[PDB]
Write an enzyme that holds these catalytic residues in place. Structure first.
Site, mmCIF file in Angstrom:
data_model
loop_
_atom_site.group_PDB
_atom_site.id
_atom_site.type_symbol
_atom_site.label_atom_id
_atom_site.label_comp_id
_atom_site.label_asym_id
_atom_site.label_seq_id
_atom_site.Cartn_x
_atom_site.Cartn_y
_atom_site.Cartn_z
ATOM 1 N N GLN A 77 71.822 -3.233 74.267
ATOM 2 C CA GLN A 77 70.884 -4.392 74.293
ATOM 3 C C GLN A 77 69.741 -4.343 73.283
ATOM 4 O O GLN A 77 68.700 -5.034 73.461
ATOM 5 C CB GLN A 77 70.354 -4.626 75.729
ATOM 6 C CG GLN A 77 71.490 -5.107 76.670
ATOM 7 C CD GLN A 77 72.020 -6.449 76.275
ATOM 8 O OE1 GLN A 77 71.275 -7.284 75.702
ATOM 9 N NE2 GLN A 77 73.305 -6.679 76.547
ATOM 10 N N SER A 78 69.919 -3.556 72.226
ATOM 11 C CA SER A 78 68.911 -3.460 71.176
ATOM 12 C C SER A 78 68.537 -4.820 70.561
ATOM 13 O O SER A 78 69.415 -5.554 70.092
ATOM 14 C CB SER A 78 69.432 -2.600 70.013
ATOM 15 O OG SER A 78 68.455 -2.546 69.005
ATOM 16 N N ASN A 79 67.255 -5.193 70.599
ATOM 17 C CA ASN A 79 66.846 -6.342 69.756
ATOM 18 C C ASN A 79 66.924 -6.083 68.279
ATOM 19 O O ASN A 79 67.154 -7.002 67.482
ATOM 20 C CB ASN A 79 65.408 -6.742 70.094
ATOM 21 C CG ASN A 79 65.233 -6.973 71.559
ATOM 22 O OD1 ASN A 79 65.852 -7.871 72.145
ATOM 23 N ND2 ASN A 79 64.415 -6.166 72.166
#
Ligand SMILES: Cc1ncc(COP(=O)(O)O)c(CN)c1O
Ligand SMILES: Cc1ncc(COP(=O)(O)O)c(CN)c1O
Lengths: 328, 319
Positions: A77-79
């Site tokens: 879920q890295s931005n």
């Protein structure tokens, strides 16, 4: 004047106009202190965030070297990965992302919704690993494999947090000083402190443009003992690239991230609820909700230098709301 | 225009951008009006309308905003965000227009946000007469001690539509353009742009791609609103309203393959996020207009991105 060597660095234009710096009257009324917010969550590429500013520099560097592929790493879920992948798609660059599951969840929205959903819209080539034990080495091995296919890869470190990437936050600090001019006298600035490019680049800018403002990083993944040398090393490397000295001490609060990177906590969730409900602002369970929980407890415990106005740097992160929902 | 009270929700004009990769792929110059980048709670076109409607609400001393839409409505989300920001209560009358029981459609994307904004939720079986049903609810809520102001569906009244007249001014300042393409749903976007562009950019063809209705059902709605906006601005409005209705089957709120293909196209070529309900359908119409030589000429096209991307997360993996 003092930040003028910033000129030397080529940079692409991803942001355009300064992002809004807004007063938060209802949150200020509730907390008892003047709160402003720097809206870097509204940068205009694919749901925005802090990484767009670093990408302006790193991607211009990539292009100058003839790279045709960006490679980076982060959690599922890295931005950061999502912004990298988005900017790759817009420029017709190939993109390969090395992802881990840092929390061991099997929850379907975490695994496939949110930022991870967007990666597939951008045609990112996704490679899983067990853990990012040594992200720099693991990215290298990936880059060799990709070079072997004839691509010309440019490696972006986790968070884009190299001295060059962090020049985007040095520039942020120029915007912020201009926007505050004759409008508010800040005492304190609060930002989440993760891979550390944002904190370090704001530290250098702010030291030179607003020396009396206190900068506070709220850790999202590590203790002060483990995070502080990282922020300092970047701070010094950024100063060096700009022919400046940086004698400010780095400030970190690490009480607001337990039980670990990527794990929501109660104070984080209550901060997200508070900002949504008072200001119509969306924070996120991993980064900004934890940093805002920090700001709030800091007011409560009188942790800041004085009672004066505080600027919160909204670094983005909202699309993770939909991945974390209903639970992980 | 400068006569109507309005709140400041947006600020600087939103970007108007060339799309060089998509233009290269399609063999035609395409530009985009980024109204998806408005700064409150993930953005969209409805904030422009809410600048006028909410100013009016406060003028009446209302303490509550009431509106209606599908569970995944962008309009309801933006209304609820503006309420929270302003310390107004918000009541949302919601329907499930597609009969789904899928968990993300029921509880994630825009609906999750309504919960973050402390919106009071009222379910109804169908919005058969939204105006009357909103009216009835407003009366109950008043009866509980509140002072409600009703916002119509899509906030698409003549007052609300002035926000789209403003967008047209920005478009004119920012712009050799031949066409403009916009989703046409509750009709304020389409009608407000229609009035603005007739005056500012009379050589441009405005095409509304419908998202919920046939040309036959939609055209009178858009025309009525066009005339009502022009009256209140003391303007004339004689431009024809152009609608393409081929792009939304099988119905409002239901994704279709051309729409999902357009979403994937804009994402992968330009890093731009559309949505399954509104803008992917409208983009699909734009693309097929090129396929079918359906525009007046081969000249530049401006696509109006009205928002909607948070519904990406509600509609995944399927409904
Ligand atoms: C929303 C958000 N906020 C803050 C951070 C942490 O910023 P930094 O990596 O520069 O410390 C990140 C990291 N990608 C982020 O995504
Ligand atoms: C993203 C999006 N696109 C466009 C529309 C349609 O605009 P209008 O309702 O004014 O026709 C809506 C309606 N809520 C929307 O939310």
């Amino acid at each position: 004047m003092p930040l003028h060597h910033l000129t030397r660095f080529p940079r692409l234009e991803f942001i355009g106009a300064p992002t809004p710096l807004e007063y938060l009257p209802r949150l200020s009324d509730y907390l008892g202190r003047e709160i402003y917010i720097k809206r870097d969550d509204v940068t205009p590429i694919a749901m925005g965030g802090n990484k767009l500013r670093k990408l302006e520099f790193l991607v211009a560097d990539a292009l100058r070297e003839g790279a045709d592929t960006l490679i980076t790493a982060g959690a599922i879920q890295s931005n950061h990965v999502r912004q990298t992948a988005a900017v790759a798609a817009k420029l017709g660059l190939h993109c390969v992302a090395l992802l881990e599951n840092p929390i061991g969840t099997t929850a379907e929205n975490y695994l496939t919704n949110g930022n991870r959903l967007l990666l597939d819209l951008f045609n990112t080539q996704i490679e899983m690993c067990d853990a990012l034990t040594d992200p720099d080495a693991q990215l290298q091995t990936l880059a060799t494999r990709i070079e072997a296919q004839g691509f010309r890869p440019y490696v972006i470190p986790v968070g884009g947090s190299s001295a060059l990437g962090a020049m985007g936050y040095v520039e942020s600090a120029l915007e912020i000083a201009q926007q505050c001019e004759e409008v508010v006298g800040l005492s304190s600035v609060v930002v989440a402190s993760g891979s550390a490019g944002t904190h370090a680049g704001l530290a250098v800018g702010l030291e030179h443009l607003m020396p009396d403002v206190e900068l506070i990083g709220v850790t999202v993944s590590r203790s002060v003992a483990e995070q502080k040398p990282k922020v300092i090393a970047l701070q010094q490397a950024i100063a060096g690239q700009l022919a400046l000295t940086a004698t400010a001490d780095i400030h970190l609060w690490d009480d607001y991230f337990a039980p670990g990177y990527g794990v929501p906590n109660d104070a984080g969730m209550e901060a997200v609820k508070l900002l949504a409900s008072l200001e119509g602002v969306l924070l996120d369970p991993v980064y900004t909700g934890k940093a805002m929980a920090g700001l709030i407890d800091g007011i409560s415990q009188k942790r800041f230098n004085d009672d004066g106005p505080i600027l919160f740097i909204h670094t983005g992160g909202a699309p993770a709301l939909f991945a974390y929902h209903p639970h992980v």
